[PDB]
Amino acid sequence: SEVAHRFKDLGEENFKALVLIAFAQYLQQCPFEDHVKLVNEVTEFAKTCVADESAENCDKSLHTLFGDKLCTDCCAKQEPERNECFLQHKDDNPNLPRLVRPEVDVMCTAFHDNEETFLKKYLYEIARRHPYFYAPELLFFAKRYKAAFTECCQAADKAACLLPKLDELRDEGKASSAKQRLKCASLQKFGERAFKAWAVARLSQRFPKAEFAEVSKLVTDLTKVHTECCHGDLLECADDRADLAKYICENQDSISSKLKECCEKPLLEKSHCIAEVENDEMPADLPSLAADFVESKDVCKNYAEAKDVFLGMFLYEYARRHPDYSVVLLLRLAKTYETTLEKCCAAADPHECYAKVFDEFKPLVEEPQNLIKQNCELFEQLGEYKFQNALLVRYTKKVPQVSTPTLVEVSRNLGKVGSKCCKHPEAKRMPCAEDYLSVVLNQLCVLHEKTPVSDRVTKCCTESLVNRRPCFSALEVDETYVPKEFNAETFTFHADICTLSEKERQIKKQTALVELVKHKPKATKEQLKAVMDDFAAFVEKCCKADDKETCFAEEGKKLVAASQAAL
Numbered sequence: 001s002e003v004a005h006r007f008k009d010l011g012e013e014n015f016k017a018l019v020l021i022a023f024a025q026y027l028q029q030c031p032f033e034d035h036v037k038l039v040n041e042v043t044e045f046a047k048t049c050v051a052d053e054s055a056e057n058c059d060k061s062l063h064t065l066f067g068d069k070l071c072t073d074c075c076a077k078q079e080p081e082r083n084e085c086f087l088q089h090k091d092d093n094p095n096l097p098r099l100v101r102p103e104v105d106v107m108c109t110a111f112h113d114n115e116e117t118f119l120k121k122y123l124y125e126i127a128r129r130h131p132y133f134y135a136p137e138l139l140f141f142a143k144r145y146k147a148a149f150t151e152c153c154q155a156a157d158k159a160a161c162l163l164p165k166l167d168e169l170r171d172e173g174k175a176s177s178a179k180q181r182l183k184c185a186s187l188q189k190f191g192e193r194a195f196k197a198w199a200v201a202r203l204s205q206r207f208p209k210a211e212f213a214e215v216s217k218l219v220t221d222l223t224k225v226h227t228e229c230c231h232g233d234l235l236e237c238a239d240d241r242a243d244l245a246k247y248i249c250e251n252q253d254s255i256s257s258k259l260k261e262c263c264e265k266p267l268l269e270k271s272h273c274i275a276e277v278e279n280d281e282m283p284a285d286l287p288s289l290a291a292d293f294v295e296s297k298d299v300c301k302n303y304a305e306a307k308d309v310f311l312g313m314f315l316y317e318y319a320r321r322h323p324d325y326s327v328v329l330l331l332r333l334a335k336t337y338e339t340t341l342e343k344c345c346a347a348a349d350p351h352e353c354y355a356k357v358f359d360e361f362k363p364l365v366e367e368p369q370n371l372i373k374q375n376c377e378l379f380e381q382l383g384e385y386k387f388q389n390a391l392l393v394r395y396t397k398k399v400p401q402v403s404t405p406t407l408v409e410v411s412r413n414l415g416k417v418g419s420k421c422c423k424h425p426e427a428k429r430m431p432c433a434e435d436y437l438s439v440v441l442n443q444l445c446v447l448h449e450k451t452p453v454s455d456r457v458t459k460c461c462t463e464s465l466v467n468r469r470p471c472f473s474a475l476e477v478d479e480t481y482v483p484k485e486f487n488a489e490t491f492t493f494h495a496d497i498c499t500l501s502e503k504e505r506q507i508k509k510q511t512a513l514v515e516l517v518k519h520k521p522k523a524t525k526e527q528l529k530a531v532m533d534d535f536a537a538f539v540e541k542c543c544k545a546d547d548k549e550t551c552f553a554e555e556g557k558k559l560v561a562a563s564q565a566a567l
């Protein structure tokens, strides 16, 4: 009796929350009350399984049960053809209104008037926009959301208290959503082995005192935990995630010294802590990697007798002594190793063939170090917004088939690497940057997957997970792309532009830049600035003007006319 097991282990509050997240992630377009009725039904039913497991239908699988509730094209099909359909029907870019924040008094009224509904609405709106949000982490976001409203709605300045907390949590969730999106992407588009490897590299860096067999047990469980959430099995996902947090905390002395605090925290806070713990102290006495991977007379034999274990050991051994290296780098190195081993172990004398394999790594390590430095110097100069604009023009030139909204979202997100990473001491910058850029390029990948337009995005996206950043970095301007033309409807200028929020002013200014590039992909920073200058002088003119709409319309014609025959 599955439904009872999960209701018992997770408890009423969490079960009700998980089931809702599941419903809002599948039927993203269905309204809040349609999900509320569905939640009440499964919760009512689960209670009649919790009271008596001996009841009918209580013995059915969660996959079979939840599937039914939605049906009250994918609904026609039955298990296993059932769940795969609803999965394939999840939307990374769902056509939903732009969620607007009400006034603080308004927000505090609704929370006081009804707490549960207020949080069910939060869980609903998030999950429906973010179909791959790590469900257990989402309960932690709700916990904090509730906890912020309890303190700020009773305080004197309800606004200045909550708004920064709301800004901190929404930035944190957008980041959580994007990291978890990459996890699912790695599992579904690349396979269990690609995810296994990624986790082996990270947990090796984070737990360098832990033995390979111990890093293996964790990754096996973490692969289970994440496959489940990505597949939609949110109830067992949240359970197995709690079952791993318990194991880690029991066997701390075999895993890490940075765990003591996390394990004394409540169950939601505990897993959140472990998921992002600081890497432990690297072991003092660590032999050279050459001893086992280059010099050892048994390399090829170990590569033949156990390719998965030996190559797994190499990844673990490099990663456990390289926390200044991004996981994508460590995986490029591990792949390179295996690749050189494939060649050399066929040759007459393999030892001389693969003898200078660590010298074959030398470029692969330098290239990210070169990128991070370059992009951070530009960051200290430009400050962020102008840094996004630089990336904007660069990426628009490489892949101009991509929609302006996707280019503006992604280039803004790429730009955010400077503030996020150039703050750390030079040595800590590469995992931050590269491991963050993979998350942002994964977004460009998932948004493009829905409506493929650029064959270059498709190639870099599908070709590899790990080589994605060098794949885009390597792209030059598109010389085969047919420049788009300007008209009366390219740009739309109204009075409202004047009173825009700073954020929306930037986004509007960036949106025009992408289009300007889409007009002339061979355009130069100065040519683009010249047109961007005239555009600025134009809204300055009409926003100050007596009429506004007549300036915006009259001068609007002249602006697009002057922008066409001059760069």
Ligand SMILES: O=C(O)c1cc(/N=N/c2ccc(S(=O)(=O)Nc3ccccn3)cc2)ccc1O
Pocket (backbone or CB within 6 Å): 179, 182, 183, 186, 194, 195, 198, 199, 202, 203, 222, 241, 242, 244, 245, 248, 270, 271, 272, 274, 275, 276, 327
């Ligand atoms: O409960 C938890 O959240 C918890 C989390 C744990 N490990 N968390 C990890 C481990 C690895 C990563 S990772 O981001 O490097 N891995 C991946 C995998 C594929 C694609 C992208 N990233 C991220 C989180 C380990 C034990 C736990 O208890």
Ligand SMILES: O=C(O)c1cc(/N=N/c2ccc(S(=O)(=O)Nc3ccccn3)cc2)ccc1O
Pocket (backbone or CB within 6 Å): 378, 385, 386, 389, 390, 391, 393, 394, 397, 513, 523, 524, 525, 526, 528, 529, 530, 532, 533
């Ligand atoms: O608002 C702005 O920041 C602004 C920025 C503009 N940037 N134009 C360009 C043009 C070309 C490039 S690029 O492809 O050469 N890439 C780069 C990247 C870093 C430094 C220099 N160039 C990068 C930026 C052009 C017009 C503007 O209005």
Ligand SMILES: O=C(O)c1cc(/N=N/c2ccc(S(=O)(=O)Nc3ccccn3)cc2)ccc1O
Pocket (backbone or CB within 6 Å): 404, 489, 490, 491, 492, 493, 497, 505, 508, 509, 511, 512, 515, 532, 533, 535, 536, 537, 539, 540
């Ligand atoms: O100073 C400014 O406010 C400023 C504003 C500018 N506004 N650019 C805009 C304003 C509105 C739009 S729009 O959203 O109506 N048009 C669109 C939207 C998407 C794709 C193509 N066109 C597109 C570009 C452009 C340059 C500037 O300097």
